[PDB]
Amino acid sequence: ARSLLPLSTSLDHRSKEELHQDCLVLATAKHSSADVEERFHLGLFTDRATLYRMIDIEGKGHLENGHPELFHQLMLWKGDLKGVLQTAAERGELTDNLVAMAPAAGYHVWLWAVEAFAKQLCFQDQYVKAASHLLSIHKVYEAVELLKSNHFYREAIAIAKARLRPEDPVLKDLYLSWGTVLERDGHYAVAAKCYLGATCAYDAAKVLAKKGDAASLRTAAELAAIVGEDELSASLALRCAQELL
Amino acid sequence: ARSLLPLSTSLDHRSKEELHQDCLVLATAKHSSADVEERFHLGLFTDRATLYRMIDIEGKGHLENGHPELFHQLMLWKGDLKGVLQTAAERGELTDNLVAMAPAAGYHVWLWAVEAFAKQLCFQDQYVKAASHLLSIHKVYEAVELLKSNHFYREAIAIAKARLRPEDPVLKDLYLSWGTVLERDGHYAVAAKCYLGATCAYDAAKVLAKKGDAASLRTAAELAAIVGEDELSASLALRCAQELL
Ligand SMILES: [K+]
């Protein structure tokens, strides 16, 4: 895998003349500074404050190399996990890997990181993944609403039907809202399945009939009969016959 | 962004003769068996049991196609993710995404998932990433020892120096261990840097003198002088003059 300390490693692989200079500077420093500042790679052998200087230089290098994930992975070593998550979020660089580490700072920090990751995924055109993350933090209704408002009706219903009681109004509204849109666009057969899902079978027969063809009228008539809307069934059946003349 | 329910989506986009049969089967099923079983795509519109059958089928399709991350989301939707985490650990198929969602099953399930994930990452020879996840559950000594025992001395030292007190014996052993290996391999100048890190300047001078050339003997003598080991410095400085004859 890729090294998290490439600049300092490269500095440590220089000529013996540079290594000899390093030993002297290092011996001087450990024996109770501009030399040390120049030779930042000595942070590995000096003190924590010079180590952190070295790490910050390597982190800057990872950003200038288009590798923000290594920057964040490296800053985790220094310990400010919340600070790492804050700047990762501000930069739109949250990842599953960083969210997976968020519970080290407490449940509350993970909650915030999951929600921030979900916002970021919406901006990255990954609504379904974002909804799944909202589910992980028990925000079932928010996940459903996110998918509904972005026209992922299929997935919203699946989640809603999996987690809510069958009679929950949110579930019924998903069926109706999807059916409505389908009807407007002319997908009458699919809209009818939707209204059936919402336990509005009368409207389901009607919408199938809006197509106007004989096949749709027949099935609409037979649908009404199954449900006990015999009067509607008779009228649709008569319309079916009229279309075949 | 692959769709999570492609098989049932395809079934829902067949000929409208097929969708008309869908409507009749669906109307019958909600107004209350073989058609119910055959047309599993109706699970989105029927009841939870049929929905779960449908989701299981879709997940099976994801696993065979090589998209287990889509199967993981479907299982989440089901709410058995916690069971699916146990199966992933047994098979060593955990992912960053699964750990990021694990706290949904409880804080200690995440703790267990991180430990299983780090164990898996070691088998996949991703030792530095494994150490990062051990840090996330505050197992610093374990992370440092893992890196050391797999010869990631540089990373081991950086993490230990960042998290442990300067006088922690673990940090000293790291320098001495790395220096020991470097010396055995003939990298005397690097080993001397490690011995300086462990506050063993006397041994640093000596090891740097093992190279034998005038430059190494010289810098070693100057190193002993900087530390106040002037007796050693004189000995090495005169060995340097003998070499320059
Ligand atoms: K909890």
DSSP B194-223: HHHHTT-HHHHHHHHHTT-SHHHHHHHHHH
CA distances from A130 to A93, A135, B9, B153 (A): 15, 9, 21, 39
Angle between helices B81-91 and B68-78 (to 10 degrees): 150
Q: How many CB atoms lie within 10 A of CB A102?
A: 27
Q: Return the closest-CA partner of residue B162 out of A59, A32, A117, A11.
A: A59
How many Cα neighbours within 13 Å face the side chain of B62?
Answer: 21
**How many A/B residue pairs have CB atoms within 8 Å?**
230
Query: Measured between CA atoms, how close is B181 to chain A, in angstroms?
Result: 16
CB A30 within 8 A of CB A46: yes
Burial class (CB in 10 A: 0-12, 13-18, 19+), A50: buried
Q: Where are the alpha helices (DSSP H) in chain B?
A: 6-12, 16-30, 34-38, 48-65, 68-78, 81-91, 96-101, 107-123, 127-136, 140-149, 153-163, 169-184, 188-197, 201-209, 214-227, 230-244
Considering only CA atoms, which of B72, B54, B53 is closest in space to residue B63? B72
SS3 category, A138: coil
The helix/strand/coil state of A125 is coil
Taking the C-alpha atoms of residue B103 and residue A136, their distance in angstroms, rounded to an integer, is 8
* Contact between residue B227 and residue A27 where contact means Cβ atoms under 8 Å apart: yes
> CB burial class (10 A; 0-12, 13-18, 19+) of residue A79?
middle
Question: For residues A156 and A151, what is the distance between their CA atoms, to the nearest angstrom?
Answer: 9
Q: Which one of B23, B108, B129, B196 makes the best mutation probe of the A interface by having the most chain A beta carbons within 10 Å?
A: B23
| Ligand 1: centre distance to CA A170 (Å) | 27
Q: What method was applied to determine this entry?
A: X-ray
Q: What is the DSSP letter of A103?
A: G
Distance from CA of B119 to the nearest CA of A (A): 15
CA of A27 to the centre of ligand 1 (A): 50
Backbone angles phi, psi at A162, to 5 degrees: -65, -40
Residues 6+ apart with CB under 8 A from A158: B4, B5, B44, B51, B55, B77
Rg (CA), chain B: 32
Number of other CB atoms surrounding residue A86 within 10 Å: 14
Residues of B in contact with A136 (CB under 8 A): 76, 81, 100-101, 103-104
Picking from B12, B129, B196 by the largest number of A CB atoms within 10 A of its own CB, the best residue to mutate is B196
CB contact under 8 A, A20 and B216: yes
* Residues B194 and B173 sit within 8 Å (Cβ to Cβ): no
Each as own residue / partner, the long-range contacts of residues A106-112 (CB below 8 Å, 24 or more positions apart, any chain) are A107/B103, A107/B107, A109/A81, A109/A82, A109/A85, A110/B103, A110/B110, A111/A137, A112/A85
